[PDB]
Symmetry: D2
Subunit: 358 residues, 4 copies
Amino acid sequence: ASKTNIGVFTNPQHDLWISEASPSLESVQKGEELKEGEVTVAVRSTGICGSDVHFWKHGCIGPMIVECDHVLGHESAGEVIAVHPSVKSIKVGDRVAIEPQVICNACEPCLTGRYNGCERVDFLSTPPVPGLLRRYVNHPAVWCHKIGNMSYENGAMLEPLSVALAGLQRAGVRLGDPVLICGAGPIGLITMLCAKAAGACPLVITDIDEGRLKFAKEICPEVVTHKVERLSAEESAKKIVESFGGIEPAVALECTGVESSIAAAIWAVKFGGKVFVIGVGKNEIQIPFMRASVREVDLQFQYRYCNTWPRAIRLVENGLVDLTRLVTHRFPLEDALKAFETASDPKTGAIKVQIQSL
Amino acid sequence: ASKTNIGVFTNPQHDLWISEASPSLESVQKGEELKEGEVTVAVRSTGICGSDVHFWKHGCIGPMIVECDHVLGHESAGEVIAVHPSVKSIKVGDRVAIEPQVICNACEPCLTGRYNGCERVDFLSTPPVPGLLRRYVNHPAVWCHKIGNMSYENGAMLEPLSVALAGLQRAGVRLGDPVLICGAGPIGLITMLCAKAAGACPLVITDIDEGRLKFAKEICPEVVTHKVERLSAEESAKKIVESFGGIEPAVALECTGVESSIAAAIWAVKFGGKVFVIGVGKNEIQIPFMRASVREVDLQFQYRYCNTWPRAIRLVENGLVDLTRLVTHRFPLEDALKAFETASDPKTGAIKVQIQSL
Amino acid sequence: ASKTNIGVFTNPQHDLWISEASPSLESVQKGEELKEGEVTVAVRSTGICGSDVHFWKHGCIGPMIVECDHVLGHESAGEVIAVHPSVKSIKVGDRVAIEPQVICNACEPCLTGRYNGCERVDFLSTPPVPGLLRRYVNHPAVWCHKIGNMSYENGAMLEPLSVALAGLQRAGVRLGDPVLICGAGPIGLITMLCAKAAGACPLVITDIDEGRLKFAKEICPEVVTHKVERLSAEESAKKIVESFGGIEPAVALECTGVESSIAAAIWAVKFGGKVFVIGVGKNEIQIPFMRASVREVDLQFQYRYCNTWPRAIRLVENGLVDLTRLVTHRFPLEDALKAFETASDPKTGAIKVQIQSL
Amino acid sequence: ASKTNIGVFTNPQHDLWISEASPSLESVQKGEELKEGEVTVAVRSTGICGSDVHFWKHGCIGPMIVECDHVLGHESAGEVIAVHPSVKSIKVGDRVAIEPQVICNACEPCLTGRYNGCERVDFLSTPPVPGLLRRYVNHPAVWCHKIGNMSYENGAMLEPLSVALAGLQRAGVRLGDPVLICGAGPIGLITMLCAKAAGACPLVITDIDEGRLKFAKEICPEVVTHKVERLSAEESAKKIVESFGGIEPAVALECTGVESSIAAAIWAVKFGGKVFVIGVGKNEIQIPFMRASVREVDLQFQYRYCNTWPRAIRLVENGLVDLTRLVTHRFPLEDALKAFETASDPKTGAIKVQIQSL
Ligand SMILES: NC(=O)c1ccc[n+]([C@@H]2O[C@H](COP(=O)([O-])OP(=O)(O)OC[C@H]3O[C@@H](n4cnc5c(N)ncnc54)[C@H](O)[C@@H]3O)[C@@H](O)[C@H]2O)c1
Ligand SMILES: NC(=O)c1ccc[n+]([C@@H]2O[C@H](COP(=O)([O-])OP(=O)(O)OC[C@H]3O[C@@H](n4cnc5c(N)ncnc54)[C@H](O)[C@@H]3O)[C@@H](O)[C@H]2O)c1
Ligand SMILES: NC(=O)c1ccc[n+]([C@@H]2O[C@H](COP(=O)([O-])OP(=O)(O)OC[C@H]3O[C@@H](n4cnc5c(N)ncnc54)[C@H](O)[C@@H]3O)[C@@H](O)[C@H]2O)c1
Ligand SMILES: NC(=O)c1ccc[n+]([C@@H]2O[C@H](COP(=O)([O-])OP(=O)(O)OC[C@H]3O[C@@H](n4cnc5c(N)ncnc54)[C@H](O)[C@@H]3O)[C@@H](O)[C@H]2O)c1
Ligand SMILES: [Zn+2]
Ligand SMILES: [Zn+2]
Ligand SMILES: [Zn+2]
Ligand SMILES: [Zn+2]
Ligand SMILES: [Zn+2]
Ligand SMILES: [Zn+2]
Ligand SMILES: [Zn+2]
Ligand SMILES: [Zn+2]
């Protein structure tokens, strides 16, 4: 702990800039602002999510509005440097991965275990709560998960790994199931790696972008890729079922949040199929209602995660998923605008951009 | 068996008229067309569903198209009059309730028990398969369910009772759950009666029609009714949550198939809530995507039923549900156009119209 | 707050006696021992559970051992008299019902919502944690549930109501299901009332005790009672299926914890049936393994509850369950040995004995 | 079709011998006994299951009693040689894998999809229904699953593969779950291969037999093996949890049917753990009731399968599971007693013994 704490900010005007941030260095060196059960973590690595890019470029997601200077990022791991005297769970020096989510333990979504839906949740990347794109953060120990000697880029990947896992779990994917992934951005790709490790088969992944498809095929040889053309939902699903052999997918994990892609997924899945939407987009979309109806197709949606962390860790420690392999670009904190620019331009060839504090 | 077999037909031109129908009387008197495992049933009573009215008035549902002279109706009970020699299960003289659905027993939806999604299904009211608005029908015994001394109007109610039950089951309604019903037409009303017998509470039912709301309150005193005004989905859900006390529903059973009503339901239910759509409407609707997303709201849809019959029977025999109480109008077969006219004009005061063959 | 705090104690020697208890009066009058988020409740009413009787008479349940002077009782409601300054949720004067369970919010069973399995749980009636058979208790606010103007005997019934609900929920009981209840002690009876409100049918309840059967039939007219005779499991299940009509139960809610009763339940339920054991008994029992096997019968077990409280409250407020009707005996705190004696002798005619502090 | 039809028989006296069998050659050459929807299959390969060995050596399983000359075997694939004119699904020359199970399509377990529990089921290896250890069998087409150019030993493995899959599915195994397998006989081994392909981790398998453990480790390098010593259930579970790291298994797939092994599994699994018993043994076993109780441990049991076939096929075609690798011994039909002797003596080094008709 020697450097001044800076952070990566955006505003309603859609600027992105670095600036000084809390806690202050001095604060952390003497453990001033450190509350009950809290620690200070030196953030070593942080992935840029579609989340962040959308907040930067647009200022909102749904009810989530950037109303003033706001620090981004929520996919992070780092080193514990200060510890409140109460903190039993964790010690100075520990590599940890940060679950960007603080829970009240008292509302219904908390007590029934669906704690991503907590009624008083602080979700770190989400306005007004400051993100993790800073050099130091104060965070409750119970949300800093020990990772032993795991690399920091892996530890940071634990968060979108968790998005994939929570999706998978609520989607109900099982060994033998034919699974469709729509979108080969970071989340699609991790979700595909996940389906594959889960024994899904056959596996198909779609995208508008050939390059991201060739990447998907390199990191998961057994998948069948499908480049999407301008077609009605109905017609797109035929193509898709062709890519599967002639088998209709049991589950579509939708990772674009885009109208046409969700429609084709509704047309593509089997009778009693599940279309699970991880992606995020417009406030309102047009849905093919009657196709969903006559097919008993379940439409499901994800809002972050819960109870994925110990399991995400296990998958990485046992080599069941290979995450680090998805980070194409690495930028130091100070160069964050370079990071966001490349993370937003697909011509870049970027998949997962990491911002680091070594 | 003395009268000529007539039926109630519609066409792409949206006519509704009575006309001669198969099997012929003589055919049934000597058991000509009677295949393996089949019986002939003298249809005693048949309810008019929204289904039928929509086929008559519009010629389709989704992929379901009336392309020529087609016999309607699928909510029926009646008396067995002829029996193939193989038929073990059922005897001449038996009151039966007819499950309007013939299964291939060989496709995946059949073998996994989701047999409403059979790939070669004959669903009797559905083109091209002739409905049950006839005097006699030939039907496999395994789809004629014994009802002992139950009334025929009850026996006929067994089918929309079944729609309610299959909804309830897949929606996951349980004792103690707060449940919203949208629409107080026949299906809403049966679904409300069902939720109530299931210990749902509190119970709210919406409609645009005050009269159908006052009826709902008469047949289910403990329900809270809610008349819908022209409001944004968001604002409508606030009203709805007000009608609940301040509790947000766990499950919305949507029985109108209408866009605005489905939207408000998405806004109304709790975090991790389920909006279950029984209703049917437009090929495409606008959905509030981000509200669904941030709330982890499951959108589900129903396509008929399976394995509801023995259970629907139990509920009626034990007095747990009171169905006959919903039939407001009774018409003889010959007067079917009167029946459909009244079943389609809400000013009629009709709830469930039955067409009979005494 | 005027009286000295006494409590109801047992020991390894199987004595039961009243004695002074913590917190002390003075402690509560000035709010000494009151920690963060805690309140002091004046316990108004407390039911004696089979739990308590077994601890008194035997000194253990499974791994739960009375090793020294221990305060019993965990089915309680009462009045809030002192409040830590932090406590937001609750105010002095509030009637509350006490969930006898303190959670760490950090272990896996806690975060996934199965918080009855918390790895560091304080369960109040359970050694070494002091029960609720005292005049005052200090308890976290988040486990004191507001009950407005509900009676204290109802508020106290909320706990075994909760045992029934958690059973029901994990057993998977639904509207239309035929349900067997084994045992007509307090828990059986509440579970029966629950099944009934849940639209279970038909309902059968067994017991060795005719009097408790006649009581069951009085409070739930529609149930069929079954007196158990000395018979093989197989033969007992035939009798049981006879009591059902000829329908085999979908679910057996077993509330005796006794070997022969569990066996007959395994024989009684349908193919793919669930036998759910609420009852507690011997460390080891003999099971009919092959019957379970060839029938795909799920054996399930309950350990208390979670997330039943707001729902238990709703059922009582809406008149869906009538609990107070089960309390046959009422004793003041000081007369607790009379209470336990009568609660343990079935010749008493007791169902639910309450101990009160008016 | 040239050879006389012989079969492998056992009797109540526990003899095993080969003898002439139905249908007769001539019968098959002219398609005499061929009913509606039926085909004749020339059985090419058939695995010996624990089932068969137990029927041979003991004469029963539970209610399943060998009462006279009975043909064994139910794990088979072979070639279609005759086809009833109705048979659409399948053609002469097709390699098929035989699902040893004929369904009535009319009882409740059939229509709800749990069709392994059919009330009028013919299960081929099970008395009185003749097994598949014959040269020709007549079987309904809908239970002969096309396998294209798959090997016959794989096609035959499809049946115990199916036992594993149905277990897995009802046990609820998912990606990331720590899974315990008890027993390294054929079923354990396939179940382990299955868990592994399902992304289970860590994986532990137990056995009394070191050789079968070394085999397990060869075919699944990433598994941790555990040799069982004579210890209390409690103490055995500690050892087991040690083999896992210190993580407690989510699911125990029990494949021995033995009392002590099931007990340790009950002690071993986590809170809310599932112990799923595939194995079969004594009519009655002693259970550790209180451990199950305080842990909310679900005990589940399997009776064969349903809807595993298309999925078992997919797993083999995509190389997700490697079955053929488990067949250690291959015997021609005529040498069946050699086959059963070796399949019953573990000193043999046998895992899966196949009996063939080339
Ligand atoms: N719900 C959550 O909790 C959660 C968590 C993480 C990410 N997300 C969301 O998941 C989405 C994807 O995340 P990402 O980081 O991979 O973003 P990304 O932009 O890198 O990936 C989106 C991909 O979708 C592809 N795409 C666009 N239109 C398509 C179409 N019509 N068909 C097929 N593919 C199409 C793009 O080419 C791109 O590769 C984002 O909207 C993000 O906000 C949600
Ligand atoms: N999915 C299935 O298998 C299945 C089975 C039976 C019926 N249905 C469908 O269920 C729907 C209802 O059936 P029904 O027989 O009761 O028809 P119905 O017209 O009698 O009932 C529809 C009700 O919706 C009310 N309504 C219209 N707009 C509304 C709004 N904005 N908010 C609240 N209420 C509104 C109407 O006033 C009417 O009372 C139909 O569309 C029918 O086809 C589906
Ligand atoms: N698992 C939990 O979290 C939990 C919570 C509450 C109560 N319980 C347990 O539930 C059980 C019942 O509680 P209770 O308060 O009603 O006790 P209780 O003794 O009042 O009820 C037991 C009943 O079982 C009857 N019975 C005994 N043998 C029988 C047999 N062979 N067949 C049928 N009935 C038989 C008795 O006559 C008695 O009526 C107790 O063992 C108690 O510890 C468990
Ligand atoms: N339920 C079904 O539908 C179904 C289907 C197939 C097989 N099975 C049953 O599964 C069981 C296993 O089948 P299999 O063909 O592998 O038989 P098998 O005898 O080859 O395997 C049993 C294994 O259990 C091991 N074992 C014995 N005692 C043990 C203990 N105390 N701890 C750990 N391991 C122990 C043995 O060494 C042996 O390797 C049989 O009982 C069989 O009948 C059931
Ligand atoms: Zn993200
Ligand atoms: Zn909360
Ligand atoms: Zn209808
Ligand atoms: Zn079918
Ligand atoms: Zn109790
Ligand atoms: Zn805990
Ligand atoms: Zn077998
Ligand atoms: Zn059957």
